[PDB]
Each structure stands twice: as C-alpha cells, then as structure tokens.
Amino acid sequence: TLKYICAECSSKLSLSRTDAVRCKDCGHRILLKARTKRLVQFEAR
Amino acid sequence: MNAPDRFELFLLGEGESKLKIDPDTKAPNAVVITFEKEDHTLGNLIRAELLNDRKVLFAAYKVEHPFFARFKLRIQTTEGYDPKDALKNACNSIINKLGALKTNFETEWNLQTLA
Amino acid sequence: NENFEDFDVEHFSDEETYEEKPQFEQIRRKTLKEKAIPKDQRATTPYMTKYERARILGTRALQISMNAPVFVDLEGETDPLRIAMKELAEKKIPLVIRRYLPDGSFEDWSVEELIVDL
Amino acid sequence: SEGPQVKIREASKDNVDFILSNVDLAMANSLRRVMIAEIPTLAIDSVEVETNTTVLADEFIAHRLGLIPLQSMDIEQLEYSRDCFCEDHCDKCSVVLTLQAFGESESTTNVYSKDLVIVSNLMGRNIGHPIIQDKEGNGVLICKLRKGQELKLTCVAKKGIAKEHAKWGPAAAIEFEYDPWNKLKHTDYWYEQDSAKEWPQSKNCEYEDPPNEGDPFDYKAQADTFYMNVESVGSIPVDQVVVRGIDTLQKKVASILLALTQMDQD
Amino acid sequence: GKSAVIFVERATPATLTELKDALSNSILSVRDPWSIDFRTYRCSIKNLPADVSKLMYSITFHHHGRQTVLIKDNSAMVTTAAAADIPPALVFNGSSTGVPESIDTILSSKLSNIWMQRQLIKGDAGETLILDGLTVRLVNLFSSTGFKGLLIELQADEAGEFETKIAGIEGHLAEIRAKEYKTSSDSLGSNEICDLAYQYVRALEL
Amino acid sequence: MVQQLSLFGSIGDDGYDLLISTLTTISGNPPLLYNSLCTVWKPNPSYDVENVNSRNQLVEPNRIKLSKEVPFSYLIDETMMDKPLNFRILKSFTNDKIPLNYAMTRNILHNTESCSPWSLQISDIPAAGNNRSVSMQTIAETIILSSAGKNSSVSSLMNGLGYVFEFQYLTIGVKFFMKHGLILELQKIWQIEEAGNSQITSGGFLLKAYINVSRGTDIDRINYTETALMNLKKELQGYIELSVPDRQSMDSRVAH
Amino acid sequence: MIVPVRCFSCGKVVGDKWESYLNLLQEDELDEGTALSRLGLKRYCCRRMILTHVDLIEKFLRYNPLEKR
Amino acid sequence: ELARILQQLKLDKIIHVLTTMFENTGWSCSRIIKIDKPILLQRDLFIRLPHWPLNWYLILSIISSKTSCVVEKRIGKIVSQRGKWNLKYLDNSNVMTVKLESITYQKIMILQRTILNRIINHM
Amino acid sequence: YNVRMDTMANILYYPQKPLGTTRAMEYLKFRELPAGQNAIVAIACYSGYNQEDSMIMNQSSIDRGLFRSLFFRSYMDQEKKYGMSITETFEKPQRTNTLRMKHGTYDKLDDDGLIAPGVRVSGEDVIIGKTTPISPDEEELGQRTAYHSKRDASTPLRSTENGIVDQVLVTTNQDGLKFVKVRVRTTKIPQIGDKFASRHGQKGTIGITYRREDMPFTAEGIVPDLIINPHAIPSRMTVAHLIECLLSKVAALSGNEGDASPFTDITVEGISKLLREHGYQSRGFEVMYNGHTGKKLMAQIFFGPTYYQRLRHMVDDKIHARARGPMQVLTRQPVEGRSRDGGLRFGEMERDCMIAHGAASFLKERLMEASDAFRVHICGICGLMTVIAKLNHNQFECKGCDNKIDIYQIHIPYAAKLLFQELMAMNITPRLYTDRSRDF
Ligand SMILES: [Mg+2]
Ligand SMILES: [Zn+2]
Ligand SMILES: [Zn+2]
Ligand SMILES: [Zn+2]
Ligand SMILES: [Zn+2]
Ligand SMILES: [Zn+2]
C-alpha cells in the first residue's frame, strides 16, 4: 500500500499493515519510506 | 525566528508614509524630516547637498538604529527660507547632477570601442 | 541530553562545597493604645525614605489603575504611575506611613507632612 | 556638459574602470551603494522539487540556484510579483525555468546552469537565460550526479534588489579610490620608520600630481576625482550597472521630491 | 453622463504635471483634490469549479460620496459607507444601524476566510481639471514598490460626442511621448460609478 | 462598529392596541408602520473553507443577512386600499396568509439590470459577560446601493462572494422613536418558503427595545443607554416584562 | 561540499571556475596561484574561495544512491 | 489690518466686475495660473479667449491707491514647465493705461477685434 | 552523515581548509574534513556593535552562504507490547476514536503513521503517529465516549524547531518489534546571537549584521566577512591571531597554504616581506573607507582572511520565554527546560539581590504569584492545615478541634504547604497561627 526502498539493494516494495517490515528480495530488515510525490516549495535564499 | 522580513528595508508598510515633517522647537525655522524605508545612501547625499546651500544654517541626518530602515534629517535655514524649499532645491540639484552624470557616462562609454 | 565543553558554571550549587566541608517591656506591652506614638514626640526622620516613596507610588498607582478618585488635575497623563508621581509632587496622596519601631511601637507620618527630598 | 565628468580608462565586458570628476563624495558613495544594493536584477527565488536523489540537500541546491546569475537586461519590462495581480507568479512578473538532470553515464554527471531551460513565455524580452562566461560553455556547477541519481525541479525567478538578498546583486566588487597621495589628509598613515616607504603607492597615484613636500596643507580642497572600477556579475552589462545605478538613485531622489510635493499640496 | 479611463503603465513620476502643462491651453478651471484606492482580493477556496474567477477588484472612490465598487466576473456591486447617501428607507425600516462600515474592512476582518487582500494601489493627492465641457482627473498610482503608472479619468456630462474628445486626449498622450497606454471605455451589460469601476479594471489589467 | 443595547419581550394580539396606546402616552410619538424583507445567506457547503482568516486568528462561519423594505402595495391584497397605513392594519395579519410569496421574493432576489438598495448585516453572538442587564450584540453593516452587468442579480453576487441562500423572513411592525434615541419595535415575522408562508410569531407580537451606539468602547455611553433601557423597564413593570433573550438564540453562526 | 556559486565577500561568480581550476592544476602543471590568476581571481577573497574549497561531493558520491531509478 | 482688508476689497471688486464683463461676452478667464512677481497695491489677471493662437494671454493689471485706480493692458506669452510658469515673451512697448470709469463693453468688443490682429502680428 | 541516523548532526554547507595550517593536521585529516571557513576579517571599531567580544558579520556574505549549516535531528520511536492486548501501534490516529490527541496537525502523516521524507514540518507537528488501547467505558475529561478505544502516544516535532523530513527508516529491533527513526533536516543561517570562534580562544557572538554597502571597504572593493574588535587583542595577547591573519593573507595572495606549525623558523618579518612583494602594507593594514559616506577612515585597518569556526550555540536553540505554562507534579512550580515550556530559576541569591534592593512586594510576587500561590485553610485552635473546606456549601470544619467558626484563610507557596505536610508525615507539627503571642 505504501512505498518503501530497501537499505542496500535499493529494491522498491509495497507494504500494508499486516506485512512484516523486511525486504523480500535480499532479506534485509531496514527499509526507507519513499520520497513524497507532491511538489515541495523552497525559497531560493 | 525573530528575523525581520528583508523587504521591509525598502517597502513602505500599511498606513505609513515615505516622509513626515515635524517642527523643531530647539531652533527657529527648523524641521526634522523622518525618511522611512531609506538609509545612509539617501541620507548622506541629501545632507551634503543641503550643506552646499548658502541659506541652510544646519543640515544633519542620523540613522538612530541599524535595525530599522529610517533616518531623521534635521534642516535649519535662514529666516524667510522654508526648509521644505531647501529640501526641494537640494533634491532638484541632485536630480540635475545625476542626469548630467548619466549623459556623460553614455557619451564616454559610446566613445569606448574596446568593449 | 547534552554534552558541551563550554563550562557554564552551575549557579546556586554550593551544597557540593557544603558536603566537601561539613566538619569543623517597660513602656509598652501587648497591643494597647500606648503602641501608637503621639505626633508631638515622634523621633523618626521627617523625610520620606526611598522605600516609602516606592511603596506610596506603587499603592497609589494600583489604586488609580483600579479606578480610585484622583485628587490632582490631569494634564493629559494616562499612566497611573506618573499620575501618582504628580499626586506626590503636589501632595495629594491621602495615605499615611506606619513606621514600626523594633519594639513594636509605631509612628504615623502622613504623606502630606513627609518631605520628599529625594 | 556642466556637472560630473566621466573618463573611462579601461572598459571590458565585465569591468569598467573610470575616473569620476567634478562630483561630491556623497554622490560618489551613494552611486556605489546603489550599484551594490539597489539595481533590480532577475534571480531564482522559488524552487519546486519533484525529485531530488542527489547527495546535496534540497535547500542547498535551492540556495545555489538562487545564486545562479540570470540575464536581467530587460528587467524593467518585468514586474514585481508582489505588485502583480496574479495568484503566485506569471509571465508578467516571473520567469519559469526547469532543471532536468539524470545520471545516465557511468562517470559523474555534472549539472550546470546551462541545463536550466526556460519554459515560461518570455514575450520577446531579454531575461531569464543563465549567464555563461567561461570558454567551455558550461555555466556554474550546480550539482553532481552518480549513475542513477536524479534532480528534477522547477525554478521561479522574480526580480529583486540586493537588500532583500545578495543573490539579486549585479555589482560584484566595486573598487573606489580618492586622493591617492593623501593630500586631503583623510588618512593618518600608520608607520614604523617611514610612512612613504612602508605604504605602497596605489595605481591611481600616476593620475594626480604628487605633493611638493614644502607647500602647506590645502585646507580648502575637497574630495573629488574618484577612481571607480565596477565589476559585473554577468546579469547586466557593467555599463548598465553604472547607468541603472545612476537612474535608480535619480528615481529615489525624484520619489522624495514627489512625496514632499504631495504632502505639501495637502 | 459618460466615463472613460486611460492608464499609462510605463511613464515617469512627473508625467502628471507634464500632461497638465501640455493640456494647460484648454483648461477651463480646477476643482478640489481627490483620492482612490484599488484593492485586489484572491479567493482562498481550495476546491473551486471551472469557469469561475478568483479575482475580485474593490475600487473606492473618495469622490462620488466615498463609494466602493466590487467587480467580479463582469458583475458589479456598488456599496457605500457614509451616512449622507444612505436611502432614508433603510434607516427608517431598521435594516441599517445608522452608521455603516466599509465593505473593504468587513472583507479584511470577517470575510477573510473567503477573500484575501493581496494588492493595494493608493492614488492620493490627485487633481481635478475641468476642460471645455469635460472633466479630466489625474493621479499617480502607488503600488507597494512606489510608482506604478499614470491615471487619467475622463468624465463628460453629455454622451453624444465622446469619441472625438477621447481621441484628442489620446493624441495629447501621443505628443507627450507615451504610446503604450491602455484606454478603456467599455460598459457593463449600468450606472456611471459601476461602469467607471469596470473601466478602471479593464485599464489596470494588462 | 455599532452595538445594539437591546431588550426583548412579547405580547398577545388582544393587548396590541393597549400597548400601542400606552407607548403613545410614554413617547408622545405615533407608531410607525415598517417592513424589512430579510434574506439570509450562509457560506457555500460545496466550498472548502479554512477556520483561519487572512490573519492568524481562527473564526467560525457566520450567516450574513440582507434586509430591505417591500412596498406596502405588495402587502395589500387588493382588499384594504381604503384603510390608511397605520398601526391598525397589524390586527388583520394573524394567520399565515401574506400576499408576499416565495415566487415574488425569488423575483426580487434575481431582479427579473440595476438592483434595489440592500442592507448587509453581520452579527455575532451577544457578549458572554454576565454583568450587563441588557443584551449587547455587535453588528457590522453595509449599504449595497446598486448593481450591473449580465450577472447583476444580488443572489448571484452573494454566490460570487461565496454565500448561498438559506432562508428568508418578512417582518412587519410598528416602531416608536422615544426619548434619547431609543428605538422600540413591535413586529410580526413570517418565514417565506416555497412550501408556504408560516407565522413564526404565532398569535402575538415580538417586542425589541434597542439603542444603536457607534462606539461600544465608550463605557459612559454604554452605561447611559443601559440605564435608559432600565428606565424604560421600570416604567413598563406591572404590564409587560423585559428580559434578556438567550445568546444561543441570538447567535447566527453555522453549526457543525 | 561542492564549490560555492559566488564569492562570499564580493559576490563574484566562482562556481564556473572549479573544473577549469582543476584542469589548470592537473594538465597544465601550473601552481595554484598562477592558476587562480589565469582564472581571473585577483582579489584574495575570490582566490581563497577556490583555493580553500574542499570538494567533498565526490566523497559523498562514492556511496551508493539510496533511491535508484 | 482693516485698511489692508479694505484695499484688498477695493482691488477685488474691480477684479470681480472685470471678470464678469469679460466672461459674459465670451472670454475664458483663467484662475489656474499664478506668477511669483508681476512687476501701492496691484492685482493681475491673465485673460484669454479660445479663438486665437495658443499660449498667449492678455495681462490686465490693476493698480490702486486711496485716490484713483487705473489698469495697464499688456500682451504676454506664458508657458508652464514642470509645474512652474514662465513668461516666454512680454510686451512692454504697446502698453496702455485706462480707467474703470472709462472702460465699457464696446471697448471690449474693439479689444476682441484688435487682439487677434496683434497676436498674428507678434510672429 | 547522509546514511547515519545521528540524534543531532551539524554540517557546514561550504567547509574550507584553513589558509594558515600546521603540518600536524594533515595526519588529523583537517584539510579533508574541515571545521570552519576562511572569513575575511577586519579588526576595527566600526559601529560599536562588536564590543565585549561581539562581532559584525556581513549580511551579504551570509546570503551568499558564509557559515550556513545543515542541522539534522533524529526522532526514534518504538511500538512495544506491554501485554497481550496492550500493544503500541503505528497508525494515523483519528479524533473520533482516539483520546488525548495533541493539538498539532496529524494531516502530514500517512496510513502507516509516518510522514514521507521531503515534507516540510514545523514545531508541534506530529511526525510519528502511535496509538495504545485503553479500557472501555471510563469517565475522564468529559470528552469520553464508547468510541475512544485508543489513546494517542504520538511523537511530535520539537515545538521550537522546524525543517524538512529528510529520511524515515522503518526496521525491527533486537526483540523483533517494529521501530522507526525520522531524521528531520533544517538549515541554520547565521544571525545575531550565534556563536563563532577563531582558533585562538577568541569566542564571540554576532553583534549585528550589515550589508555590503554598509560594510567598510578597501580600495579594491573588498569588504570583510567579519569585524572583530581591537580590544579583544591586547589583554588576551593572542598574537597568533594576527600572525595567522597575515600568513593567510600572504597565502591567499600567493595561492599557497601557510605553514603555521608552532616551532618552525617562520617569522612575522618574513611574512611581512612576502606581503610587501605581493603589494600590500607589510603589517596587514589597509586603507579602508567608511561604507556610509565613502570617506577614508583616519585609521588603517588590519585586514585579511582568518579561520573561524561556527559554534553550535545558536540563539534560536537558547531563546526561551514563559508567561504561564505546565507545572511540576510534586511542587506545582514551573517545570525545567525550554523544550518543556518551563520557567526560569529565581534562586536564593537572586532573591538575596532583590532583598538588598528592598523590593519586598516584587519578591513576594516572584515567589508566589509567579511560581506557586496556594490557598489553604487553618483553624485558630491548631495551626495545622487539616481543615476540611466545602466552598460550594460554605462549610469549614476541623476534626479533633471540632470547631467550625474559627477557620482562617492563608496564601502560602505550594512548596511551603508540601514542606508542612512532609513535617507532619515526619511527626513535626508546623502550627501556623495568625496572631501574635509574645512581644517584640
Ligand atoms: Mg562571557
Ligand atoms: Zn533488500
Ligand atoms: Zn504575475
Ligand atoms: Zn571575492
Ligand atoms: Zn484544628
Ligand atoms: Zn480533599
């Protein structure tokens, strides 16, 4: 449901609530939540 | 957090004017003019031009605090001469000098051919 | 938490040093009317002290802020502290100072008769 | 014409060196201050980041993009965005640029200011283009990408002056000299043994007569003959820096005149 | 009558007195000074449908009884805040409370969840000049960065002959060396004040 | 920024003439027949709004009302031209039958060029301070003078400002301008609906004694108008009772 | 981290000179002062802006990207 | 002060009656114009009628005393630059002094029939 | 640092290696990971805003990036299983079914109870959303119903801070429980009150910031990034600051790095000579001009680059005010810490300074109306605070004394009431009486 990236193999994953928080490709247990899709405003100062 | 907005160094706020003039009771025929949203760039120019006027007895300015973009210009003139009129003549002569400066720089830059 | 090399001295921290070095009548009785010293034999100064001036100004300013009648004419002054200062200046503060002597006796000195020399 | 005289010694694309005579020190310093702080310039002010997978922070890149110099020749034809009637920004008050950078190469891909692409309508004006000065054709090194890294963003460039932020300053450093022989004695020279030996002569000492060492002090002499070297960042030509500084100071004095007359006629 | 406006966007601060000096040969008289403010309101509704504008222009003339006109999507609303020009019926029937308040301050105080003020242009210390059978009326427009443009307001008390006069004023603007003026004489649909406000909107919008 | 120093009450229809005579004796002024069709507009439910405003203070949405007169030829039902317009005509108006109907009020609202003058009134809940013996309410009002354009109807103007029609009522009554600026109104209220009119003040007249003060900051003026209201109350004791109505009743905010 | 766009003191654009500075150092065999002079940095503020810059961005880039497309 | 106000009234009644006689027959008298010095007590009026060339005026300058009051008639060319009025040309050669008891509407019509020719002659 | 989830991290935008450097630091890798910038420093009494170790920084240099820094703060949270049904969970809470929700926004959270990286957050904004189950059918705070099955145990951002969510890391601990770490990134831009030090014991805060047109300037248009006061030099005898500024000037002119190792044969006369063939006054003085008027300053200014360090004491991390706020559980005095919206200590010797001033009413207002003003009832028979007071029924009674008409009202600090009750627990009777018994 929500988008995650593995720590070192950089694989994209979709996680629901009941899913265990682990990587399905290499078995690593550290996942980073994805960058938001919305545009983010920065003043150039 | 407490830093002021940097456009308030030159942008007049709501309900405030560029100029305000108060009479000065310390000396006869003298005014104090508060220039809002201006600084030393204008202050030194206007004061030094007012001091070139022979009918101006006193001309000084001060920025009382660097936090606030305003300065106070005290002008005292001879009797029968309005300090408002002295400000007008000083500003007009500054305008004329700057126009002559712009014209001279145009002519000399056009004379330059290595650019 | 915090870990800083800038030695900010722990103020009000003397108990470390404490634990380091721990080893080494005739004229007036009760509350009778005699406690009131009469006006003719008052022995205190006729001058208003700095503390008397401060508390009279504070009390009068508090009363003026809480809408007491003002016994001077106003010159456009709105702040109760300067209204109280003007009332002190031309002596229109209807208060008295009860100066307590160490034996429990007291002297009543009105603000009108006290000299404001400071 | 009668007034301040200009004698340009050296002229270049990004430098003008000139002598400014028959003028007051207040006028010369006010012109220097206006050129530093008061000339309107186009610079990137707003950054919308859609993708940033770089090693640099978002506002790091945004600050760099704000400091990128942009062409500002027709900046008077652009309008202040706070004065414009649009909601946030539009073609009348801003220039919209786009940066699209991807690491498709095995080596490090440099993201330059030449990769900024104007996507708004310029309406035939001469603003918005990043300034290229070096011979390689690249601009300022904005970022660096490893393979797989992406930087995807949109800039909104609005006009401003350098008191609001120094990114809007077009004047770099401004060399300013008067009285190279200290004939007015506005400096008292610190020395150990001999001030003339220990203090190097300036390059403008060749354009004035040296003191005769027996003549007395000239108490009537004032400060004129200002040697000024204006440098251009690149946003506007350096002669336009000087000329628009003069014009900006003139509009300030004219605004003082008009405010004075407006409250006089009330 | 009939009204029109000319807005000279790119002009000097002294263009007012220059145009007055150029028109001085035809001036019949001079009247009292006037003032005006031009407020811009943006709609802050997050979900607005298509074919609706978020712009609302609030124009307060300190002449014409100090009246404010709101313009939105070619729709005008005339509003007053003075007690002189209230109809006596609203005072007598208890709908009004004697003294009104300005719609600008009510918008900026208690209708600010819908409309937010962003731009304020104040034309103060203006002049009114009476020509031959006509009224021109000048002011310098002040946005937040000082001067914005020159404003000329054409008033005529007959409407049968107006195009020759407006062409003549445009000609005077031509020999005062101003060629990129925006001239507006459009109507709505329709009284003098609301047509004037719509003309002001069309002139000030590029 | 007006404040209405107000008291409220009610009478039956039988005591209406007795109260008219009594107030005529009190004031020395004859009663003044008046009407004001009040149309009420609430913010659009399809518009997502923010609780904050242009500044950082959070506010509630509020119903804002538009009031104007209706000519009495539109309230005469072609049967009472002969009797003059006075206080005596309010005895006939007891039931729901009013000649002003929903179709004609819709015609008035939609202007089917130029629009009639209106009064735009915005009122919050009265003050919560339980130390004033009279109901103090804050009302901000403009006078909408005229309109034009192809979209010149005042309903569509209210939609442009973002407010849709909710309900409307016609009030008809008589008022007295008595001593020192006290306006005492005595009125009937009918709700105008497409399903039919309804007499809200069923079988009686509503009483509202109010004073408008331009500066509610002027505490001396507030106290003077308040003690004028209590002087009227003391003069009216025994016959009719003046009391402060509920602030929940006088609140015009949109509930959620 | 990466070369600054402008000199801190005066605002001269120096971020376009970093690659040419490195090239003048490594393939023209110039010493650093002559390289700065050939770039045109005559004020020592502009000279130290390039001379003292420690370019840590390739040290950051040697790490694998966290989000890879 | 009463005497100064009375002499002000002396000149102002004459100014009013001359303005009335000029504006009744068709002269567009100007009050938008002011001069710092027009060269006893005197008062100037710059009269113009819009059927003869631009930027030209007739200066009617009354001079008054306790006894006798007369008026000088001159022709001038006044142009305004940057809000300041300057007399580009002054005609002190063909100047005549007449009295208010001697001026009449017929002489004003002769003045109309003369000033057009004079304005044509002055260039 | 980009892959390290440190609790606090401060990174310079543009670290610069020092112009004046030692031979020792290239084994310390100081030229590879430097901790400062070479700021052009003038030693001048310019405006009086650099006195008592204050400094004037260039606002234009600040705008162009002088001493700008990234600040990273990591917030770690866990969901733990206290029992069977008592388990914490990461979710986006809803006000309809969750009790004690914080007044900050929950809208930036996603379905997992976490904010995606890249989203701007401000103070008191919920960044980690956690709920814990509670016992149904209770009565607390009035706003309690049967729908509130959970209560909020969320982690919000620090109330004074803000920034951008840089990274969100979701993993498992040793126990297997899910736990998250949220790194939020902000930018500290230098401002008045930020602390900067040179490498010679010369600490100081920014006194004021001037723009370039207001800064003093040389004949070449060089303005300082920093003005420090001449009075910081002679008493402190930091001659090495002057020598390093001279050496850094020579190094910047020659394109080298200066050898500033301690016990070498490197002299001020040699550095001055090299500065002289670089065409400057040999002792580091330059003729500078006043920025306000353009006139030459009568004194010539010691001018040149100096290595300065941005210290981590920023004024925004230290500014703190409290009108009213939370009270401590025990003493009901203002709590400790600026992060808890706490009070400031009015200690014994601050009280003693007030005593020496003679401000008795201000002292009483500080100790009572500003910390803890507690009303308590005693009786005339025993001085104890064991008087049962029913203010709604207007009924006062003391057990034991059995008196109901001899009740006195006193205002004491809650700390004083706690002291008296602790004495009562320790079997001391601190009987408080409202009348005197013996003479003075
Ligand atoms: Mg200290
Ligand atoms: Zn993996
Ligand atoms: Zn725009
Ligand atoms: Zn530089
Ligand atoms: Zn007891
Ligand atoms: Zn209890």
PDB file of C-alpha atoms in Angstrom, chain D residues 55 108 144 146, chain G residues 1-2 18 22 53-63:
ATOM      1  CA  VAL D  55      23.841  13.910  -2.244  1.00  0.00           C
ATOM      2  CA  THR D 108      29.877  11.610 -12.572  1.00  0.00           C
ATOM      3  CA  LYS D 144      26.982  16.350  -9.417  1.00  0.00           C
ATOM      4  CA  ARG D 146      26.315   9.426  -9.713  1.00  0.00           C
TER       5      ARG D 146
ATOM      6  CA  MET G   1      30.978  20.157  -0.082  1.00  0.00           C
ATOM      7  CA  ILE G   2      30.578  21.465  -3.629  1.00  0.00           C
ATOM      8  CA  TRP G  18      36.240  24.948 -10.444  1.00  0.00           C
ATOM      9  CA  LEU G  22      41.352  21.594 -11.577  1.00  0.00           C
ATOM     10  CA  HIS G  53      37.425  24.873  -1.102  1.00  0.00           C
ATOM     11  CA  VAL G  54      37.395  21.223  -0.048  1.00  0.00           C
ATOM     12  CA  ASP G  55      35.304  19.426  -2.637  1.00  0.00           C
ATOM     13  CA  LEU G  56      33.633  16.695  -0.571  1.00  0.00           C
ATOM     14  CA  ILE G  57      30.903  15.932  -3.100  1.00  0.00           C
ATOM     15  CA  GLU G  58      32.771  13.023  -4.712  1.00  0.00           C
ATOM     16  CA  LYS G  59      33.359  11.639  -1.216  1.00  0.00           C
ATOM     17  CA  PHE G  60      29.578  11.782  -0.838  1.00  0.00           C
ATOM     18  CA  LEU G  61      29.131  10.337  -4.348  1.00  0.00           C
ATOM     19  CA  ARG G  62      31.273   7.252  -3.689  1.00  0.00           C
ATOM     20  CA  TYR G  63      28.353   5.957  -1.603  1.00  0.00           C
TER      21      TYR G  63
END
